[PDB]
Design a protein around this ligand. Sequence first.
Ligand SMILES: Nc1ccn([C@H]2C[C@H](O)[C@@H](COP(=O)(O)OP(=O)(O)OP(=O)(O)O)O2)c(=O)n1
Ligand SMILES: O=C(Nc1ccn(-c2ccccc2)n1)N[C@H]1CCOc2c(Cl)cccc21
Ligand SMILES: [Ca+2]
Lengths: 945, 353, 352
Amino acid sequence: GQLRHNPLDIQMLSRGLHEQIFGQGGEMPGEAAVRRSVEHLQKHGLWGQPAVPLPDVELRLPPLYGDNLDQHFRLLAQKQSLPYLEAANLLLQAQLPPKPPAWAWAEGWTRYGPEGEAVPVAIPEERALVFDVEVCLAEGTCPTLAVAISPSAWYSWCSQRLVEERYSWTSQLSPADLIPLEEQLVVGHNVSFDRAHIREQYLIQGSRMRFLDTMSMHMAISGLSSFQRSLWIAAKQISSWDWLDISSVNSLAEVHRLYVGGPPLEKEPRELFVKGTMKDIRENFQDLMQYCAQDVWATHEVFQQQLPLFLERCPHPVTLAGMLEMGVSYLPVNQNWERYLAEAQGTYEELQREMKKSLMDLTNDACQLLSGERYKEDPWLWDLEWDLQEFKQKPCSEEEEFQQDVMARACLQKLKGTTELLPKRPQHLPGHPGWYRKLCPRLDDPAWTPGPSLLSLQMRVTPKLMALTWDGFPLHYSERHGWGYLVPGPYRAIESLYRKHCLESYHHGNGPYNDVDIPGCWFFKLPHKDGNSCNVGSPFAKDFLPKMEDGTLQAGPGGASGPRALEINKMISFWRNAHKRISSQMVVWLPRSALPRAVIRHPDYDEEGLYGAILPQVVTAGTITRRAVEPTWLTASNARPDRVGSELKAMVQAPPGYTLVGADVDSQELWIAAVLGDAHFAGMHGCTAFGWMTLQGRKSRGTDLHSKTATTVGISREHAKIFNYGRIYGAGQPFAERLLMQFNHRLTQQEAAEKAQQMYAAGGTESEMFNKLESIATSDIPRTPVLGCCISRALEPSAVQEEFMTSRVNWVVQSSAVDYLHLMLVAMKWLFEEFAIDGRFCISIHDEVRYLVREEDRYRAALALQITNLLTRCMFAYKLGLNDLPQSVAFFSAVDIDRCLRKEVTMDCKTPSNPTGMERRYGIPQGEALDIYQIIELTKGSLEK
Amino acid sequence: EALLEICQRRHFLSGSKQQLSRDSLLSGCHPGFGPLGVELRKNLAAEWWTSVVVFREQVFPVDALHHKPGPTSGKLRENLLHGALEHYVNCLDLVNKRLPYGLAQIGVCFHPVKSIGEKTEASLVWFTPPRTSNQWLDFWLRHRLQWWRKFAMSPSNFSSSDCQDEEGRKGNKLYYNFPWGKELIETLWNLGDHELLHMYPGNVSKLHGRDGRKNVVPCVLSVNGDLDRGMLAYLYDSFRKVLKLHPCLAPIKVALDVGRGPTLELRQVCQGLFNELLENGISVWPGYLETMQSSLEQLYSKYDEMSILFTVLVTETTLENGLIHLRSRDTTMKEMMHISKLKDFLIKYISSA
Amino acid sequence: EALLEICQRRHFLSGSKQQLSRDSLLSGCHPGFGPLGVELRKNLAAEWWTSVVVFREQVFPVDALHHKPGPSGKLRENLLHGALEHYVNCLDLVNKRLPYGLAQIGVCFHPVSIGEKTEASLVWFTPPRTSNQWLDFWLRHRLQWWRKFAMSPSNFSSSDCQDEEGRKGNKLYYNFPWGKELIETLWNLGDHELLHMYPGNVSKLHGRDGRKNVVPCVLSVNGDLDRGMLAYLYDSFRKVLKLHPCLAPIKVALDVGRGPTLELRQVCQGLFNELLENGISVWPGYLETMQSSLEQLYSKYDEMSILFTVLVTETTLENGLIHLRSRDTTMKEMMHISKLKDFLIKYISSAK
DNA sequence: GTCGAGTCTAGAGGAGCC
DNA sequence: CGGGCTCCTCTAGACTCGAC
Ligand SMILES: Nc1ccn([C@H]2C[C@H](O)[C@@H](COP(=O)(O)OP(=O)(O)OP(=O)(O)O)O2)c(=O)n1
Ligand SMILES: O=C(Nc1ccn(-c2ccccc2)n1)N[C@H]1CCOc2c(Cl)cccc21
Ligand SMILES: [Ca+2]
């Protein structure tokens, strides 16, 4: 039968699939190993508990090449990366003539032959290049000029927005406004910026051009952590410091120094392309072109040094193939993108005005404390600047009425000329106090609005203006210790307010800080969610909403003024920090000619609508764990009912005739850690208590580790993710207690501590995984257990001895997860190319993969994704040598098939800026989440057509 | 009730206390609005006209008569929607038969109370394609609520409710939370083509509006606000006894005064400044023409109750150096600015508000 | 007659062609006004307000209702009665001083059918000694205001008349092509009405004139803003309605000449928003696709009393030049786009 | 030539993602 | 001993520069 079990009674894979992944002949675990596993499981009280068998799956998988799974993946990745390694080798051997002395002032592409001449060309027409793009930030996101290095010649490009000057250029970018190019490899430093400026990249159909990044390879070879970058910059200007000499920050100058050495790399002192205007660029064309040539030459010289070191420390072809596939992200958009930007900005402005109305009102109503010097009796605003300045100095007939009008006009016309005794620029609100003055926009300010329009909840004066009290004590700010409050004991006026509050140190908290020396009062810091060592920067944080609703934090005006202020702050906190990124996103709109015929002919095609794309500017390896990095799309918030503009990802909408098919891995790092611990203890699945708990439980049934923790301690499931992954990678009991108190408001100090030890109870459940991680991390050259990729030279034990231990131990599992992502991308590309599944890679977040599939091939894409997950899990098992895979983790829980990017297929993104919803406003129906059996039924268990 | 006391003291309202009970104001049986009441209502109508008609390429004014002739004796109009529906076909030719387009009007309507209550109402009949009718209704609900909250010191007191007609037609109702309760200030209805088809029986080709590339009969969206109760709403929202109406709504902008002496020259200075601010669209209260000449504190309180934005004080020193004093109602603080830069700033403070 | 056809066609009036007649326009029984007619009436009312109430502290606005309750009410027939009712309580505005006036614009209902007319009225309370002088002063100012916007101010006339009682009064006319019609009337009505409305204890009607208390005299200045609009349409009438710049409803016609449509529409929309923020009314002719001939567009805008027709073309994106055409003179000039708003404001101010 | 008003970085606390 | 990232606003100290 297809039902199979291990010596420890865990349902393994179906027989048909096992005969195709592992074949036959794997070594039996042995009696001693099984006895040890049974003893461990019985000791932890986990033996003898049956589980309902999951239904068997019978699949005819595509023919796997080679003799086993590793050879299969190697062959796939070598076929993927073979031409691009050839292009890199071409860039690694050829020698280049020196840059020409006189650049060409021409529109288009220019090729510099020998003796510095300039020849007009249509495209660089080279397999391998080093590319750099210069963009004038004053004219928007259109490229300005670019210099490209070929293994044979120099190349230069200039936009028509540089050669020609016109009154107005289109704000809506088009492919014709981009840099023309196009089996090609393009190398650069932060190539994703330069990829975004290539004309042919925005086409919906894919292109064979791939990109290699110097920051990514630097992070792969000699990269630095964020704390490491801080320490390195502090030093360039722990007991281990040998890592400094073999590492650098991602800046091109620093990387060139690290790898190639030689004379220092110099930057343009004026920074024209960021601060200057187009006239400056036309005036200074030669200098800026020479600087671009210098940067591209430095990048070429750095790539020459990095490529062999990268191929040495990361020898598996899957790593390079995945890094090539991870850098071709693609996000399609439409006119709903413009509507979303407009609506989100409008909602943000409306809420901003609503909050500033209350703000300005109270401030304008506090100026009366100046009259009579009454601010000394105000418990809040006594410390501010109340001093005032001075203004410094250096019937009638028709004829009678006309004459009187002219005389009354001339009387002031004489007075209108006495301006000679006044300064050129008038003093700003000389009469009002200094505090009021600072909060009013100056008259010259381009955007001027009447009143204290420069006031916000983040200002250090706002809580005093709104008279916020914590347990009835006025909030007081200490520069050394952040925010806080004053317990009495205007000290006379502070007690009077507290006495009134009681009608409507004896107080225990963060202790009376004696440094503040406020007379007749004590200082207590506001309880911060991350402990007593941290300082509060603003009482209007999200963590203070429960305390405001409970009434321990109160507003002076009372009523809903305080809670509404905190609610509006929570609504606009994301947009306030991300609107510059989201609004400025480089959107390029495709004309009807460049669109595919499927999009044009589809019923949902709109003749009056726009269709475009956003290429995420992804740093492929921007992490010591070799993760991707993106300022916007890797920080894009999920749709929440209270957050303005949080439907950002829902605006990534497939064109007509297309859908987004993707999935997210389930308990990825939990399973990776458990399988490592299992392979360390005995060569079976479920040997350890942690591995048995991980396997025993389904996400649909709500019994997995995250859901079990959420039920046990009461927090949400994402809060349980934070809790569990913190505990795995180093969080102590105080961290767990603080996280529980933060995410579960009903718990007390004692109750949270007890529920921490319940999750921290376990010779233990988690012993073997910890031992394996600490053994690999302390190895002479730590490497990924699956693809064998080495750690950065800055984190090896020789470079850092007994330092950054948490970073390395977490690096093991996290870089293994990156290996998982590389394997998934490789296998998905292989299945898409082999069976002609029309589609392409859309975007990957650190454990999610999205594919812009055509409508007719959504279920084939779903089956391909399930097969990919199956093969990747079996590869993880095979490298560790377990020679089996549980049926519990063989496939995805569900594959999302949606027309927009959202966490759940059923949730509707009803946010303050999107109150109607995606269905009512933009006409986006709900998607479907399908597990393995449903996909098998829909596609007959085959990827063919 | 102190608000109505101050309003009748400062000529926002008329009559005695008997006619100024809140029931009389709400019903419409009060006498006419006072002069400052006329100015405040004019400012509300001007802001409404700006937002709805001025900045939109497809909203046009319409002249609907106050009486409904014929079926034997005629009647006074109760709503402005009927005349706009009568002008629908005529104004279809302006937008070249392209939907959506609107017909806006501010007028007086007569509601039975058997007394007659007169209400000034601002209407927008917004012909829309049937498919996007709910979208346009939600857009107009949000726009109108934002407009009412734009001039509000407490925008939360302006609310909306989703209501259904006795025939099941969708609609929304705006409100202002008065101290006594929650009164209706505006109403939107997605009427449909019922009224258009009833008023224009027979062929429907004349009623067709070109939505995109297809002809369609518009679904009438009726927006109707109460500018009298809206004026009362803003008087309550505004209300040291100070109104604090909006700078774009305050009836009288600038109060102009004098100093010590010489009287004759300062009179000429004030006359020139008065004419300047008048020619620049800024309404001025000539306090220099008063003969009683009370103290500064009494004038300050008097002007505070009248929602006076600024108090210009031309003293003798305005002759010497051209500097004039200015007190702001917002903060009760005095500042000095030159006589050459008063008009430009006043235009700035108002426009940017 | 052709002017009425133009007004109906260009949305100055409303209703069917056979529905609009001279008598129905003079009486108040016409269907109403088109959007251009409504805006011309608003312009006339704003000019009347500027020339009467805006530039005089002594003149205040009032709010008289349409119906008079009590002895089963009826529609108001004139704006005088409400002003006389408001006379007593309005003395606190002037601190019981004298003279002072009350002015208003509103619809007055006249039996004919029910005729509605937009009548602009001003009542002037004065001591009887200077009553004739104030009457002559107001007559001068009103005739100056009427002739200010006129292409041919000879058509506006003035006359002297006596009522049945025998009080001095003037009648202001406009010489329509069919004959002179009453567009305004001034009467020195005395104190009969004020005493009849307020009998007994005349101490409440005393006005201070040099510390002397006087029961005042009322001057009635009743114009016809609807007949004023008709007079200006007739006087302003190649078919061109050369309305005065301060009265013409829409000033600028903004259009698109070439492609690309997106960029030209963008620059036209920016120009539209700029001109609107600067108080200039613009006809958004750039929205229309498949435009007619430029000559036909010029004729249409001339019949609509459009001051200037601005055409934005492909060249505008290159340098900023826009084709500018004037209503009064059929002369085309090219001006930079950034200088258009200041030019329009300057032209409006100059013709004022 | 003195000193006070604009510009500029650096650091700290808050807030999105996995 | 959570880890790996990303960016923002606000405040303070130092520098520049210009007008009197
Ligand atoms: N606070 C967090 C969040 C995430 N991760 C890491 C561990 C996860 O394996 C990976 C992906 O995050 P998910 O939130 O997707 O975690 P799971 O994949 O376990 O959850 P799910 O089963 O819902 O996908 O990121 C982490 O270490 N700490
Ligand atoms: O709202 C504002 N904005 C601003 C911003 C700079 N400003 C300025 C204006 C003139 C000279 C200097 C500075 N003004 N100012 C109000 C608030 C306080 O009161 C007044 C008064 Cl008394 C007079 C004028 C304006 C105001
Ligand atoms: Ca996951």
